[PDB]
Amino acid sequence: TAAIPDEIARQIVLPEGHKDNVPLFEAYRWLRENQPLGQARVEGYDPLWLITKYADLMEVERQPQIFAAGGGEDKGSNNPILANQAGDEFTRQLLGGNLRILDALPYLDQPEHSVVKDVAFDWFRPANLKKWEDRIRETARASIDRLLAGGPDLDAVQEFAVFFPLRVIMSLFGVPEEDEPRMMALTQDFFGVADPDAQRDDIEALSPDAAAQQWAATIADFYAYFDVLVESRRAEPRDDLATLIAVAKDENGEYFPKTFAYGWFVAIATAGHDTTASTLAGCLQSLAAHPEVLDRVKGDPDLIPDLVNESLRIVSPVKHFTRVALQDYEMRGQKIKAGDRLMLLFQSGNRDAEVFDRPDDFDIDRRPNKHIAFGYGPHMCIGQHLAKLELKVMLQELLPHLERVEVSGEPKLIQTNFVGGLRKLPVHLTFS
Ligand code: HEM
Ligand SMILES: Cc1ccccc1Cl
């Protein structure tokens, strides 16, 4: 019944707690082994049930009528992305009493979530993505040509891994190549709200609500950009994902409000590339630690999907979403009360020893690989099949050209409790 001990709680709740994976994952592990379902009571944050166990992540996510993302009928009464209390108070001042700062899927509950998700559900299905595979492969090959041309010493993140997923999504989305640097800069602002090296110049960086001010400022910039794109595609439809979303109409034949398109566009323009980049960079880091794995996958390219799945499990770049209990609920001998918030720790679920043998080992021979890196339930990642296709295609084209990866300098992670992973991975590559 006791609260989680303060230093374990802070390690997971505070963005600074995620600056180094070793103490973070040790805190995950301490909870899974000693307090698998406890409440973190960190100063400046609401109390949070920390959902650390794989089974409990599934139990919560499969019950959206009990555990809401946005607050149920009181729309925007829960922030699905953990802000501090001061930040949620900033947002309630900005919006007028609620936290629904985007109309994007994470903020929605059923049935609204189901209606909006159905706009793009079919586009994202694996069979409907096959038509993009050749364009993806041409983009991978061009990115690899530049890697070979630039020589063996580089930052595998900022000088390689970031560009391929961004070009893929912007090409499919319909954003011109000259706008990629702007989308990359706003993505860094968006996922860097609490990172000391990613602060915007137009917000008070040291204010208690700084991250929330940066989140809002970045969204306003994305809205200004996407307003032009929505109007453009409504006026002149094209065969791109921007058009599918911009022209979408509800069951009465009326356009969805423009903010619904902007929500899709923010998600596609940020998570649509950043997570794939993180997973690719994490894969390279693991191939440096496990050179026998690189040798094996060059020997059998049919192992590439297994390598992708184990990179997703280990990297798990999307760290959490929050839920709120709409009624009292008992789980794992604990009494969650109506109104209590939950933090879904996907990275911890992915290390649960009840599910994965030697969960901290990089083992591509987990078959099936039961990872929960894409979450679960009706909110399960819509982009999962595009991410797995892009990572497969890039590795099929890249690994033949790599004999060895060496990490030659200190890796750096984005300091976030939300969408993280590497921002820097200095390497020495040996080309074949
Ligand atoms: C390695 C790549 C990725 C990982 C690990 C990842 C992971 C996740 C996770 C854990 C969630 C939350 C699921 C939940 O609430 O249960 C999520 C949601 C989502 N992701 Fe992905 N993601 C990846 C790539 C992508 C891509 C490529 C796109 C789009 C092109 C995308 C779009 C979304 C959207 C729109 C949501 C919100 C879904 C909803 O709330 O219904 N993701 N992702
Ligand atoms: C903002 C965001 C982050 C991760 C996955 C999806 C979305 Cl929409």
Buried b (16+ CB within 10 A) or exposed e, 134-170: eebbebbeebbeebeeeeeebbbbbbbbbbbbbbbbb
Q: How far is the CA of 268 from the centre of ligand 1 (A)?
A: 9
- Going by C-alpha positions, the residue among 56, 38, 33 that lies closest to residue 360 is 33
**Method of elucidation:** X-ray
What single DSSP character describes residue 351? T
Q: Which runs of consecutive H residues, i.e. helices, occur in 290-424?
A: 291-299, 304-315, 346-349, 384-398
Asked if 90 contacts 214 with a C-beta cutoff of 8 angstroms, the reply is: no
Quote the tokens at residue 268.
């596609």
Q: Looking at ligand 2, which residue's alpha carbon is closest to its atom 8?
A: 267
Q: Which residue has the tokens 């209590």?
A: 340
Measured CA to CA, the distance from residue 359 to residue 194 in angstroms comes to 29
Q: How many angstroms separate the CA atoms of 357 and 365, rounded?
A: 11
CA of 267 to the centre of ligand 2 (A): 5
Task: Name the DSSP letter for residue 74.
Answer: S
Tokens of 357: 């043998």
Beta carbons of 47 and 25 less than 8 angstroms apart: no
CA distances from 283 to 90, 170, 289, 393 (A): 38, 23, 10, 14
- For residue 334, list its beta bridge partners: 331
The structure tokens listed for 225 are 């950009």
State the Cα–Cα distance between residues 183 and 269, nearest whole angstrom: 7
Residue with tokens 């501090």: 84
Q: What is the CA radius of gyration of the chain?
A: 21
Q: How much distance in Å is there from the Cα of 76 to the middle of ligand 1?
A: 20
DSSP string, 79-141: -SS---HHHHHHHHHHHTS------SGGG--TTHHHHHHTTTTTTTSHHHHGGGHHHHHHHHH
Q: What are the strands of the beta sheet with 37-40, ordered from one edge?
A: 37-40, 48-51, 341-344, 322-325, 67-68
Is the CB of 386 inside a 6 Å radius of any atom of ligand 1?
yes
C-alpha 362/C-alpha 124 separation (Å) is 29
Q: Whose CA is nearest to atom 4 of ligand 2?
A: 271
Question: What's the 340 CA to ligand 2 centre distance in angstroms?
Answer: 22
Q: CA 325, CA 341: separation in Å to the nearest integer?
A: 6
- Regarding the beta carbon of 377 and ligand 1, being less than 6 Å apart is answered yes
CA of residue 212 to ligand 1 center, whole Å: 21
Ligand 2 interacting residues, C-beta cut-off 6 A: 104, 106, 267, 270-271, 318, 419
CB 31 within 8 A of CB 70: no
Assess contact for 215 and 100: CB atoms under 8 A: no
Residue with CA nearest ligand 2 atom 1: 267
228-237: list long-range contacts, CB under 8 Å, 24+ apart. Answer: 229/174, 229/175, 229/265, 230/258, 230/261, 230/262, 230/265, 233/174
Amino acid identity of residue 372, one-letter, is I
| Partners of residue 37 on adjacent β-strands | 51
Q: Is the dihedral of CA 323, 326, 328, 329 positive or negative?
A: negative
Longest dimension (CA), the chain: 60
Q: Is 98 in the pocket of ligand 1 (CB under 6 A)?
A: no
- Give the count of beta carbons closer than 10 Å to the beta carbon of residue 324: 24
Name the β-bridge partners of 402: 431
